[PDB]
Design an enzyme around this catalytic site. Structure first.
Site, mmCIF file in Angstrom:
data_model
loop_
_atom_site.group_PDB
_atom_site.id
_atom_site.type_symbol
_atom_site.label_atom_id
_atom_site.label_comp_id
_atom_site.label_asym_id
_atom_site.label_seq_id
_atom_site.Cartn_x
_atom_site.Cartn_y
_atom_site.Cartn_z
ATOM 1 N N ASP A 165 0.879 -1.078 0.014
ATOM 2 C CA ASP A 165 -0.169 0.177 0.083
ATOM 3 C C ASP A 165 0.847 1.335 0.010
ATOM 4 O O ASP A 165 2.242 1.312 -0.001
ATOM 5 C CB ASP A 165 -0.871 0.113 1.243
ATOM 6 C CG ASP A 165 -2.158 0.946 1.008
ATOM 7 O OD1 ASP A 165 -2.375 1.218 0.010
ATOM 8 O OD2 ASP A 165 -2.508 1.401 2.229
ATOM 9 N N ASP A 214 1.923 4.510 1.981
ATOM 10 C CA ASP A 214 1.884 4.779 3.532
ATOM 11 C C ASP A 214 1.052 6.200 3.582
ATOM 12 O O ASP A 214 0.711 6.822 2.630
ATOM 13 C CB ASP A 214 3.326 5.208 3.805
ATOM 14 C CG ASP A 214 3.511 5.181 5.540
ATOM 15 O OD1 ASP A 214 3.074 4.449 6.219
ATOM 16 O OD2 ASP A 214 4.176 5.937 5.848
HETATM 17 N N1 LIG Z 1 3.021 1.007 5.475
HETATM 18 C C1 LIG Z 1 3.768 0.198 6.284
HETATM 19 N N2 LIG Z 1 4.326 0.703 7.099
HETATM 20 C C2 LIG Z 1 5.345 -0.384 8.077
HETATM 21 N N3 LIG Z 1 5.374 -1.746 7.708
HETATM 22 C C3 LIG Z 1 4.459 -2.401 6.936
HETATM 23 C C4 LIG Z 1 3.686 -1.340 6.172
HETATM 24 C C5 LIG Z 1 2.901 -2.242 5.239
HETATM 25 C C6 LIG Z 1 3.437 -3.442 5.576
HETATM 26 N N4 LIG Z 1 4.019 -3.587 6.568
HETATM 27 C C7 LIG Z 1 4.899 -4.675 7.031
HETATM 28 O O1 LIG Z 1 3.768 -5.724 7.155
HETATM 29 C C8 LIG Z 1 3.687 -5.674 8.628
HETATM 30 C C9 LIG Z 1 2.347 -4.703 8.965
HETATM 31 O O2 LIG Z 1 1.091 -4.883 8.169
HETATM 32 C C10 LIG Z 1 4.671 -5.446 9.326
HETATM 33 O O3 LIG Z 1 5.443 -6.708 9.524
HETATM 34 C C11 LIG Z 1 5.325 -4.436 8.402
HETATM 35 O O4 LIG Z 1 7.112 -4.738 8.233
#
Ligand SMILES: Nc1ncnc2c1ccn2[C@@H]1O[C@H](CO)[C@@H](O)[C@H]1O
Ligand SMILES: Nc1ncnc2c1ccn2[C@@H]1O[C@H](CO)[C@@H](O)[C@H]1O
Ligand SMILES: Nc1ncnc2c1ccn2[C@@H]1O[C@H](CO)[C@@H](O)[C@H]1O
Lengths: 279, 284, 282
Positions: free
Chosen positions: B228, B230
């Site tokens: 996605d 952020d």
């Molecule tokens: N927008 C984001 N910011 C930080 N982490 C993200 C995301 C999107 C996915 N992840 C990773 O997936 C897990 C959280 O959904 C966590 O395992 C993470 O590493």
């Protein structure tokens, strides 16, 4: 159904916002709260008061048990939490004596328990990944702001008013906080770096309190109190008058919260917790 | 001979990358790995699979035992580690469904065990100061990229191609990750701050996994999966898109293992271990 | 009177020693035993940050015990050396920086003497750190360099073309990282774009704890290499260091003498007063 928790920071080590009905010495799965919890009523609205640093302010920001404080309020049936947070100003428009109803933050804390969930015995089972794009309860933010208006306190909204409409002391309709670990204050170098990042105030207590409140399914809003400019710009009286007007804001906010239905807001809070489970 | 370790992130809690030949329920001097290690072969190449979060995804990023995970793979004789990392995009050109073969990172984690060495008895004796200028194994990065090419997936290189060549979905040939501690996602304030630093993605699991892999003398490469945007910027389509990404990453991983085994790595492995010894600051 | 503690970083693991002293502290044991002696009439104490074998990494150094042990012995000042990588063009290997600022990026280190846990002194101490160093002691390090005919570069008044190496930079800001790994290029450029001058692993919380102890603290950073933003490893930090050790030794010895030649009555009073006035539990 609505019960309003209040977490008092500096200037609220022992608030006495209403006649004490009951005193609660509780413990949580995450340890003991900063102090005992005082239950009472503001009008017809049930209310609970809890000093973040304890009665004597002996617990530094890094050592506050945020989990216990938030969870204890939750166990007592709170649906909302109003918090105070003393802070330094990173901007010239934010003057000692002003308040800020925060809508954003940047986290620079460490070594604090910032979540109820995990894989260790210290925690509730599950992996919780909570959205925090807008980390506060917006409805409850607008309550704090409306409360200030009801108490004839100036409100400045930078989005709808120009600079000349900023009359001090005033409540800033929005603002972002950087939360540092403490206990030391920032260096001039750190202060300028935060200011260049577009941050408005610096404080030591907002995080993880705000994060844990959302985790617990509670509507959370903070009112930040500008005690001074941070050291990018080279007394107790302004702070004494500040807590008086903050008291008014809190008391009025509790009434305003109780004057409305929160059924769908409370429900959405709960659902967001369940939908954020990754396990 | 080589042996490729695979650390599967989100979407790879129970990978089933090959017919399981053997399973290892082991421990390390740094504690227990996230789960059992599954051993087998990709063609004639030995391979070992480990879910970073365990089978049921019960272990949050901050509590993963990266040391045990990396060390267990090392103990089994792995020479390489390939990692998947779910992430949010901080830039317009990186869209959900894209992948990123990371070359850089910025670390904002804390409270994680990030080194095998120290002065405490519960760590290996010595002080290790590793260079991390280019934190990944470059050869292994290029293998991930070539693997994507071989599997008919678009590859986009911003340094060479115009933005007119950025066709989604694509593997970004370079990219920087900010690693946050979690478990919560960033605020909008934090998202814009990260974006203004020029960072491409945000993720919770890259570090210290990449650091520890180098400390172990292993070649490490990460393929980030953009799930996605952020929060600087229907869910059923989002879920379906991620499932498709997982299919693509799976075939990239499988082709990558084949590519690794097809080449000689004597010098690279030797250099890997020598880099460890030369960072032993207590050996002067 | 005055007494100068000297915390030696890399390559400082200075005089005719009178004796070696083992001390304990309410926060644990110092990195090593301490060397007691004199420079002229000035009492001086020497303490290696990483131990005599350099087996203690920066994140595991007991800064609390080291600083308090110097305090316990009656030190009024602490001079510190810190090896570092440069983040800017004008700071080259062999240069030195008399730091006046920092940005903290450490975690998991004991950084305060006070708290509410049993292994800390009772109370809440909120110390101002706007200008984290003792200014008098900074200007003494800089003046010490002049006395030993080492060039001093002041970027507030001097031209980039007038920068003569090797020089002591009269001001500078450090980013302190946790270690033990060095920075990535990405991190390096981010620190550079923030306007920071050097990167190091040992300044904080040492500088913070010294002010908590009411001691006048100043740091001289030793540039051992450029950080990885240009075309850094363990062996490189050591080699460049050799020629720089000699100059730093000269500066420290001279600085000790300069300190002992002035009255510090009111400065010391102000230091201890700042500690009391920062207690916010009272
Ligand atoms: N927008 C984001 N910011 C930080 N982490 C993200 C995301 C999107 C996915 N992840 C990773 O997936 C897990 C959280 O959904 C966590 O395992 C993470 O590493
Ligand atoms: N300029 C600042 N930077 C960081 N924290 C500040 C300020 C000003 C006030 N506070 C808050 O008040 C306590 C320390 O003064 C702490 O509780 C803290 O949250
Ligand atoms: N470019 C750099 N980045 C981080 N640390 C550096 C350098 C250069 C020297 N040091 C210091 O040397 C020790 C670890 O090698 C530590 O004492 C550390 O402070």
């Amino acid at each position: 159904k609505v019960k309003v928790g209040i977490i008092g920071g500096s200037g609220f080590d022992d608030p006495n916002l209403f006649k004490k009905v009951g005193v609660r010495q509780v413990t949580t799965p995450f340890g003991k709260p900063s102090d005992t919890l005082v239950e009472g009523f503001v009008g017809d609205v049930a209310c609970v008061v809890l000093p973040r640093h304890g009665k004597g302010h002996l617990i530094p920001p890094s050592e506050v048990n945020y989990r216990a404080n938030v969870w204890a309020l939750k166990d007592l049936g709170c649906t909302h939490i109003l918090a105070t947070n003393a802070c330094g100003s990173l901007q010239e428009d934010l003057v000692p004596g002003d308040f800020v109803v925060l809508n954003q933050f940047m986290d620079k804390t460490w070594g604090r328990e910032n979540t109820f969930y995990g894989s260790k015995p210290d925690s509730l089972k599950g992996v919780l990944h909570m959205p925090m794009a807008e980390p506060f309860c917006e409805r409850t933010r607008q309550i704090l702001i409306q409360a200030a208006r009801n108490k004839s306190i100036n409100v400045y909204d930078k989005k709808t008013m120009d600079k000349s409409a900023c009359i001090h002391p005033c409540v800033h309709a929005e603002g972002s906080a950087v939360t540092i670990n403490g206990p030391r204050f920032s260096t001039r170098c750190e202060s300028f770096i935060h200011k260049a990042m577009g941050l408005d105030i610096v404080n030591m207590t907002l995080v993880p309190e705000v994060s844990l409140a959302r985790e617990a399914g509670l509507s959370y809003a903070s009112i930040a109190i500008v005690t001074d400019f941070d050291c990018w710009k080279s007394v107790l009286e302004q702070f004494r008058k500040s807590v008086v007007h903050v008291r008014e804001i809190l008391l009025e906010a509790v009434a305003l919260i109780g004057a409305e239905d929160w059924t769908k807001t409370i429900e959405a809070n709960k659902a967001l917790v369940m939908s954020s489970r990754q396990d």
